[PDB]
Amino acid sequence: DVYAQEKQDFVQHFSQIVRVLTEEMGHPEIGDAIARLKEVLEYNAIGGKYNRGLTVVVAFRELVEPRKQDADSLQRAWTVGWCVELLQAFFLVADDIMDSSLTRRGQICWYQKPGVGLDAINDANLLEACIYRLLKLYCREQPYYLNLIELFLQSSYQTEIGQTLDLLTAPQGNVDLVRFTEKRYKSIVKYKTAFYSFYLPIAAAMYMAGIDGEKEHANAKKILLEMGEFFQIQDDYLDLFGDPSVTGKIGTDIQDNKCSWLVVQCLQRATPEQYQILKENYGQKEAEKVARVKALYEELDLPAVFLQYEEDSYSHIMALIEQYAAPLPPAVFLGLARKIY
Amino acid sequence: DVYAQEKQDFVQHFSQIVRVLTEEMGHPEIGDAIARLKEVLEYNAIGGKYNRGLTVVVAFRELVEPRKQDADSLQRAWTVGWCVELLQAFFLVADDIMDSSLTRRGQICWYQKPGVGLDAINDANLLEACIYRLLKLYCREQPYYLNLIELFLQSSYQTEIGQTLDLLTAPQGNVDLVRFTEKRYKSIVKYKTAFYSFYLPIAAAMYMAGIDGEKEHANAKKILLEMGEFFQIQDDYLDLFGDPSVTGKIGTDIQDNKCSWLVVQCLQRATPEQYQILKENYGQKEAEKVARVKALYEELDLPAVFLQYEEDSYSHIMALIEQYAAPLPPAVFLGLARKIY
Ligand SMILES: Cc1ccc(-c2cc3c(NC(P(=O)(O)O)P(=O)(O)O)ncnc3s2)cc1
Ligand SMILES: Cc1ccc(-c2cc3c(NC(P(=O)(O)O)P(=O)(O)O)ncnc3s2)cc1
């Protein structure tokens, strides 16, 4: 991976991110808050694979004439990559509280730690605020400063809108399948995950590289939102049919009344007898009642529909790279495609 | 009031704010989210006196040569005033959840409405996001655009930091009076309320007027943070000794283990017998155990200490206006002083 090359340099820069967000050394009065902020950063922004933030860095290598990769330019790319990870950490701390999740990456969610609770709401907002403090501290003089601020702000808004739509669509506690439509599913994915996950990191790299034209961004967006769509559809598939060792942790999507790609397809493909069997069994705790939905999906050959979808989507993404990548190097999109397929 | 003059024009502009944040008319997919956003705006940003947002407008009249008050400049001042109110609504929706409050302005807190609950966390973040959407929609071309974005972002961070400090200082459930010190109290007030309440609206007016020098801002800040300090100390006093009719709703500060100005003074002024009587009775539900703290304050003549403090603070604020207002018209600060004293 072009990712395992930049990784150590990215994780090591985190120490600097933290030092600089804590050192408010002129103001001793707020010392205790700043220590809490340190703890929030370290618990919530560390632990994952850093795919989104690393993408900022990789794409920045690929886009900027290598003679303009002076030590400070890369300082800035590492920082902006960390900004994407902090935005992510803000979303997830807050989502975990809204979902009443227990763990995140097999670790206890921050709001469930003894003594944190709902104070995590302020902590989450502090994660988000750290983004603009870093952008100012590192990128204030740069011609892309305002472009980046607007990008991060816009990425928050799109994600929050998507979250609202998700929350209206699948309220934990209300089995209503009439809400689970293909259009709604696509819409949730695009706003809630694809913009920040796929558009944001590439677009940030673009602006840092001086590539600020609206059409270029619109062109990169069209490719990258499609990738985000596929990426989430594959997550929904693996959640149930992923070999749970190769994958991670067993999936709870059906139990949670999620607007999964699977239930969406199931509903489109269903005798009126089938819809009832789903109305009855979907969103339940009972293992044998989730084993029964798994069998209704298997019986509808949705794994084959998925495999069929994964191939079609792969050709489509390549047609899109062909058509919309220029004048960015196609490898910017292709590295991403390779990681997700 | 120079405030009751601009008020109707400010409240009426809210309809436009809302129309423009809802009309995402090109994107029908997100219709349901946008309707939820409308409901969140209307429930949480309407209902108070609009003192902070109005200040933006009043100060903008006083600061800009009246020949530069074309209909669009005032559109923008009304919008930026509404931005300050939305920032406030973000803080309060989120604080109410963190405090487990029941009502806000005798009305049911948004997170306690049937069907909202912890989804209010996303709603709060949407309130905050609306600020930057309005700034973009109305002020994108203006030379003060970036200055305003940074001001709002900085005001969020200061407030969030203050909130952390508050939460560490007075955890509901942990009677620890060793944390309640004058320095800590002042620090909480300055970060948590004074910056957004007093500095922010004037500073926004300043930038819109073209007054962007760092020293001018530092000068206005020094006056305005002092006013914010007094304003909060007066709130803590009225909370207990306010005639509850003239004031509003009876005060629960002692019950809630708050870092009130009153307990801070009480602790400084206390035989070691007194400290025990406070250690025992502070933070309790029982009416007769809150009636007992009220009597320990009365017995220490803290109402006289307050009256003494209010006079000293009034002279100090006037000395500060004299010294630091120039070259802004002293009336910018004096209108505020008149409203709070
Ligand atoms: C921009 C960008 C680039 C790559 C990714 C990928 C995430 C991911 C992935 N994610 C897994 P993880 O590696 O266990 O985090 P998940 O935790 O998101 O369910 N697992 C396997 N391959 C990939 S590729 C996500 C976003
Ligand atoms: C910038 C600025 C300007 C004026 C104020 C004032 C708020 C306020 C006030 N606030 C009362 P309210 O009028 O009942 O909102 P509170 O709800 O804040 O406890 N009550 C009486 N006078 C004043 S002056 C606050 C901030």
Side-chain angles (χ1 to χ4, degrees), chain A residues 2-4 6-7 9-22 26-48 50-64 66 69-174 176-182 184-214 216-248 250-257 259-268 270 272 274-283 287 291 293-298 300-306 308-341, chain B residues 2-4 6-7 9-22 26-48 50-64 66 69-174 176-182 184-214 216-248 250-257 259-268 270 272 274-283 287 291 293-298 300-306 308-341:
Chain A
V2 189
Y3 289 73
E6 326 275 338
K7 177 141 160 173
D9 299 287
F10 179 80
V11 174
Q12 163 61 9
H13 178 64
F14 189 68
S15 265
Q16 197 186 289
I17 288 311
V18 169
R19 187 179 321 115
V20 168
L21 291 175
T22 52
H27 284 292
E29 48 177 353
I30 57 165
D32 287 5
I34 294 299
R36 163 66 166 244
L37 172 64
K38 179 163 183 173
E39 217 197 332
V40 168
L41 285 163
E42 276 169 342
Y43 194 92
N44 294 293
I46 293 283
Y50 319 114
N51 292 311
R52 294 168 180 67
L54 280 164
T55 296
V56 180
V57 176
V58 167
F60 170 79
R61 302 276 192 176
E62 292 168 350
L63 283 187
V64 161
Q69 308 179 20
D70 58 81
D72 292 350
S73 275
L74 286 163
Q75 277 270 301
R76 295 184 291 260
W78 296 319
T79 297
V80 174
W82 276 111
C83 287
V84 175
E85 297 286 324
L86 293 172
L87 183 72
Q88 181 168 247
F90 155 58
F91 294 157
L92 302 176
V93 167
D95 287 356
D96 283 348
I97 298 156
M98 295 182 261
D99 286 355
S100 306
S101 305
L102 303 188
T103 61
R104 156 112 8 231
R105 296 149 195 156
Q107 195 164 61
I108 299 177
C109 296
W110 177 248
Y111 86 98
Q112 300 276 11
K113 280 187 82 65
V116 182
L118 300 181
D119 295 356
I121 295 165
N122 200 51
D123 295 330
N125 295 319
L126 283 178
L127 289 162
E128 177 189 26
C130 277
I131 286 154
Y132 302 101
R133 290 184 55 74
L134 296 165
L135 290 179
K136 181 173 175 205
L137 283 161
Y138 282 88
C139 300
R140 208 175 50 266
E141 319 302 344
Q142 296 302 319
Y144 52 73
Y145 182 49
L146 175 58
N147 282 328
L148 290 189
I149 287 168
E150 286 188 331
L151 180 65
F152 279 90
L153 288 171
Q154 179 176 34
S155 295
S156 288
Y157 171 75
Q158 293 253 338
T159 299
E160 294 160 0
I161 278 294
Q163 177 60 345
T164 302
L165 213 52
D166 203 15
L167 290 171
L168 298 177
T169 297
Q172 70 196 206
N174 223 346
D176 212 327
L177 308 167
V178 175
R179 298 200 229 80
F180 292 172
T181 72
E182 184 141 46
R184 174 58 56 91
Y185 174 83
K186 282 190 184 231
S187 200
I188 291 169
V189 170
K190 173 180 170 191
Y191 280 95
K192 195 189 163 165
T193 59
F195 193 99
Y196 94 92
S197 291
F198 288 93
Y199 176 66
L200 160 65
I202 293 303
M206 289 170 71
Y207 288 115
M208 301 185 61
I211 306 170
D212 65 355
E214 301 196 302
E216 275 99 340
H217 281 265
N219 282 342
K221 185 182 279 174
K222 166 155 219 194
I223 297 165
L224 293 161
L225 299 186
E226 262 281 313
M227 290 187 39
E229 187 168 290
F230 168 77
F231 177 76
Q232 181 68 57
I233 290 175
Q234 174 172 251
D235 261 17
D236 301 355
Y237 178 88
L238 295 177
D239 187 281
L240 197 58
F241 295 106
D243 165 54
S245 67
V246 167
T247 54
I250 280 179
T252 53
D253 281 352
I254 294 178
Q255 298 155 62
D256 306 331
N257 199 41
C259 199
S260 181
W261 181 82
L262 293 165
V263 65
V264 166
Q265 295 295 325
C266 183
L267 295 164
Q268 290 191 13
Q274 309 286 44
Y275 174 63
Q276 279 296 123
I277 296 164
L278 182 66
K279 210 218 205 86
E280 304 264 280
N281 284 288
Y282 202 80
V293 181
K294 181 167 213 286
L296 175 62
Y297 287 180
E298 268 173 54
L300 294 163
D301 297 333
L302 294 191
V305 178
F306 171 71
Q308 182 73 79
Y309 164 83
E310 176 172 19
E311 306 155 17
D312 287 347
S313 148
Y314 190 74
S315 310
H316 188 55
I317 293 287
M318 292 296 141
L320 292 175
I321 290 186
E322 286 175 70
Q323 200 187 344
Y324 293 109
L328 287 49
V332 164
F333 300 107
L334 289 171
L336 288 178
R338 181 142 184 278
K339 282 222 120 209
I340 75 182
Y341 286 92
Chain B
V2 189
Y3 289 73
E6 326 275 338
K7 177 141 160 173
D9 299 287
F10 179 80
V11 174
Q12 163 61 9
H13 178 64
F14 189 68
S15 265
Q16 197 186 289
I17 288 311
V18 169
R19 187 179 321 115
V20 168
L21 291 175
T22 52
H27 284 292
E29 48 177 353
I30 57 165
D32 287 5
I34 294 299
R36 163 66 166 244
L37 172 64
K38 179 163 183 173
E39 217 197 332
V40 168
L41 285 163
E42 276 169 342
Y43 194 92
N44 294 293
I46 293 283
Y50 319 114
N51 292 311
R52 294 168 180 67
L54 280 164
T55 296
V56 180
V57 176
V58 167
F60 170 79
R61 302 276 192 176
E62 292 168 350
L63 283 187
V64 161
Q69 308 179 20
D70 58 81
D72 292 350
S73 275
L74 286 163
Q75 277 270 301
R76 295 184 291 260
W78 296 319
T79 297
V80 174
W82 276 111
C83 287
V84 175
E85 297 286 324
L86 293 172
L87 183 72
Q88 181 168 247
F90 155 58
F91 294 157
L92 302 176
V93 167
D95 287 356
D96 283 348
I97 298 156
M98 295 182 261
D99 286 355
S100 306
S101 305
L102 303 188
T103 61
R104 156 112 8 231
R105 296 149 195 156
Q107 195 164 61
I108 299 177
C109 296
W110 177 248
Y111 86 98
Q112 300 276 11
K113 280 187 82 65
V116 182
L118 300 181
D119 295 356
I121 295 165
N122 200 51
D123 295 330
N125 295 319
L126 283 178
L127 289 162
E128 177 189 26
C130 277
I131 286 154
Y132 302 101
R133 290 184 55 74
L134 296 165
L135 290 179
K136 181 173 175 205
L137 283 161
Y138 282 88
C139 300
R140 208 175 50 266
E141 319 302 344
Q142 296 302 319
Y144 52 73
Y145 182 49
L146 175 58
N147 282 328
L148 290 189
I149 287 168
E150 286 188 331
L151 180 65
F152 279 90
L153 288 171
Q154 179 176 34
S155 295
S156 288
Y157 171 75
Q158 293 253 338
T159 299
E160 294 160 0
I161 278 294
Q163 177 60 345
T164 302
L165 213 52
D166 203 15
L167 290 171
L168 298 177
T169 297
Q172 70 196 206
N174 223 346
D176 212 327
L177 308 167
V178 175
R179 298 200 229 80
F180 292 172
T181 72
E182 184 141 46
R184 174 58 56 91
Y185 174 83
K186 282 190 184 231
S187 200
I188 291 169
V189 170
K190 173 180 170 191
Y191 280 95
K192 195 189 163 165
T193 59
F195 193 99
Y196 94 92
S197 291
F198 288 93
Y199 176 66
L200 160 65
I202 293 303
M206 289 170 71
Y207 288 115
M208 301 185 61
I211 306 170
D212 65 355
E214 301 196 302
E216 275 99 340
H217 281 265
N219 282 342
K221 185 182 279 174
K222 166 155 219 194
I223 297 165
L224 293 161
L225 299 186
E226 262 281 313
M227 290 187 39
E229 187 168 290
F230 168 77
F231 177 76
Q232 181 68 57
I233 290 175
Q234 174 172 251
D235 261 17
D236 301 355
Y237 178 88
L238 295 177
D239 187 281
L240 197 58
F241 295 106
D243 165 54
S245 67
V246 167
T247 54
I250 280 179
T252 53
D253 281 352
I254 294 178
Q255 298 155 62
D256 306 331
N257 199 41
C259 199
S260 181
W261 181 82
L262 293 165
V263 65
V264 166
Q265 295 295 325
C266 183
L267 295 164
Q268 290 191 13
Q274 309 286 44
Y275 174 63
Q276 279 296 123
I277 296 164
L278 182 66
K279 210 218 205 86
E280 304 264 280
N281 284 288
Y282 202 80
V293 181
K294 181 167 213 286
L296 175 62
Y297 287 180
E298 268 173 54
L300 294 163
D301 297 333
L302 294 191
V305 178
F306 171 71
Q308 182 73 79
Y309 164 83
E310 176 172 19
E311 306 155 17
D312 287 347
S313 148
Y314 190 74
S315 310
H316 188 55
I317 293 287
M318 292 296 141
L320 292 175
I321 290 186
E322 286 175 70
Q323 200 187 344
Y324 293 109
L328 287 49
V332 164
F333 300 107
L334 289 171
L336 288 178
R338 181 142 184 278
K339 282 222 120 209
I340 75 182
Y341 286 92

